[PDB]
Amino acid sequence: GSHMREIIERVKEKTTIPVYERTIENVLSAIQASGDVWRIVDLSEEPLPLVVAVVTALYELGYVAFENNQVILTRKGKELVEKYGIGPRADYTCSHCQGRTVEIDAFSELLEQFKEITRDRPEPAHQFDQAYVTPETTVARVALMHSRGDLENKEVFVLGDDDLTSVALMLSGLPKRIAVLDIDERLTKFIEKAADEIGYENIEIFTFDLRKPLPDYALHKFDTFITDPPETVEAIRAFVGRGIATLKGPGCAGYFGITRRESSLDKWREIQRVLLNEFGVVITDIIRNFNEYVNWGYVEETRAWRLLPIKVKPSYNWYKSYMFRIQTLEGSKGFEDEITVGQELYDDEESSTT
Amino acid sequence: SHMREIIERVKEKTTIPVYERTIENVLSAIQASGDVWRIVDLSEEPLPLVVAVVTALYELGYVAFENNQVILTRKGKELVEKYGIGPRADYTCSHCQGRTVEIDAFSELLEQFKEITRDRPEPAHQFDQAYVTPETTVARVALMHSRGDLENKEVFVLGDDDLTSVALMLSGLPKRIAVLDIDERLTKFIEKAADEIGYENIEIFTFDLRKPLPDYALHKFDTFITDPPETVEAIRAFVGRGIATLKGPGCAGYFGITRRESSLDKWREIQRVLLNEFGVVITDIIRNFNEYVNWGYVEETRAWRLLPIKVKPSYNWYKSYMFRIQTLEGSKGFEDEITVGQELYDDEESSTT
Ligand SMILES: CSC[C@H]1O[C@@H](n2cnc3c(N)ncnc32)[C@H](O)[C@@H]1O
Ligand SMILES: CSC[C@H]1O[C@@H](n2cnc3c(N)ncnc32)[C@H](O)[C@@H]1O
Ligand SMILES: NCCCCN(CCCN)CCCN
Ligand SMILES: NCCCCN(CCCN)CCCN
Ligand SMILES: [Fe+3]
């Protein structure tokens, strides 16, 4: 246990994010499958500052080197993983649905129509923690929600919409109505334009900062919400918890992404406790890597770029999130308080992509 | 109003929570299938609740029974049109059956597993048994391996009608396996597969999980897998004992949880157990991962007594969600004794015994 304990102790010198032996193993498993740091973050499913602290520790202690912009094991690193029985991570993700559990064959035309309308979507804004999902992801969200009975003739709230779910939902023709908000008036303007272009008239669009309580006319009036939030626990409240407060009562649904990239499993535990104890909802589904995010232009201006020991733009869409589905029950409630935070809505110790 | 009257009527027939949503799920299901087993499947409501809802709908004029089908009457057709309730669409991935993993890489393992489990013990009613399909078993292996929870790991199997322990032996992945079951027919069958495979690093034992696990077994495994009954007691006795087997933070557990025999109210109570009593995190919840082979004792169960049409199921209607959990700082398992008999298996939401 000494070699492993020494690494763990070194990591704890570098980060206040929890670390366990299993943290080191996930990183070491990943490094054996790939030398690209982005991909090591992805495959390890650890948050990026923790992976950087672990890779640094491993370098310091002699177990890893940086060669030709790859993170590699040294001979001593090879002996370390052989001694502990850590092999490379195998992956058997369904090559058909990309692990989403839903196929989007039935929505091909809607995906083509969605690509055509969003070809000029607002570029992601660093100040609002933006990054849109692939169009295939946005269409997969519709299909998932429809498969669980949460769109057809339902009143749908979209809290934040860089992903332009509201456009795919207008294209589907399923909801009875849609309300959408966002802080970014480029997106509220774009959705308006797209609704005019579609001839969809049961949408209400508004600009809003979710640090503030939603107005009464958003409250207790919707069947389904979807949001794709920042990952501080305050943002989870501001986005997911306000989504829950839009819901009519029991038997309504909420959809949102949560990453392993910017949230440790200790933070997931805290988030789950919020859901189950503060809001009283049930989690019906948690589906790995459901959301695939398109690499954002502002990468070189973020923490992640500053932390990484090898600084090369990602070559593939390394950043993914799990889709959560929740459902209200007798007693569930939402979040209605004001949040007074500035940039810390987005930024905590585990985040790095602003 | 129309909907309120139906809700009120269901509530006089069950103590299981009823919402407008519960009615919607049933009505949406009836529009896709008239097979009562498929109605239960598609509605994702527990069976005794579905029966209550269908009875209420019958007594109120919205549903009828014809040629062994549950159908909407004309008045029921009016109802679903008025409330805008359509048939349920389903876009489940046809290549992985929604499991999120494909088993192409394990074709040899699947073949060896089917060969060796040809004569597996048939499900015992008294133990709440029903084995999953061979493909499900192999998919469990694929899932667990993809999350780094098998290779050179010490794996505890709590109950094993599914014969996961035999798939694990054939994979060759674990450092070792320990398997317990109340049913000596399964412990004997596993021991026999182990001698036939030549697998040395397996401990096999007959045990009744109403009892606390021996000291010997506590805090010594990397991964556990169980597919439990769904009373909150059984959750403690199977999953919470599973957690107690684990070495500490960073260890994993796998189990199935149905919508067939647990309401979403009981899911919320189960998840609170996990998060608050055991302090584990849930890392995956994957719909219909587990497909169960129809069991022979069906006509001796509550399900059969309750159903308004009683024909044996013609396809595997019974499925469960795969949960994966992981331990963190302060996670803890269940060590107390449980003193229920049949109520281990049996609560108001259950029907398959
Ligand atoms: C968090 S990125 C998801 C969406 O949330 C929006 N967003 C970010 N912060 C806020 C906020 N404080 N209020 C409302 N929308 C927000 C973004 O502009 C984006 O489209
Ligand atoms: C509940 S069915 C899954 C497995 O659990 C086993 N099982 C059922 N009840 C118990 C118990 N009380 N203790 C141990 N194994 C059990 C069954 O024999 C089966 O293989
Ligand atoms: N900083 C770029 C990454 C942002 C991802 N988060 C917001 C974008 C949503 N479309 C969502 C992470 C999942 N909670
Ligand atoms: N009574 C027949 C159905 C039993 C299903 N459960 C036990 C069998 C496991 N192999 C598992 C339900 C999932 N928790
Ligand atoms: Fe698939």
Curated annotation (Swiss-Prot), chain A:
GO molecular function: transferase activity; transferase activity, transferring alkyl or aryl (other than methyl) groups
Pfam families assigned: BpsA_C
Presence of keyword Transmembrane helix: no
Top-level taxon in the UniProt lineage: Archaea
EC number: 2.5.1.128
Function summary: Involved in the biosynthesis of branched-chain polyamines, which support the growth of thermophiles under high-temperature conditions. Catalyzes the sequential condensation of spermidine with the aminopropyl groups of decarboxylated S-adenosylmethionines to produce N(4)-bis(aminopropyl)spermidine via N(4)-aminopropylspermidine. Can also use spermine to produce N(4)-aminopropylspermine.
Similarity comment text for this entry: Belongs to the branched-chain polyamine synthase family.
Name of the protein in its database record: N(4)-bis(aminopropyl)spermidine synthase
Biological source species: Thermococcus kodakarensis (strain ATCC BAA-918 / JCM 12380 / KOD1)
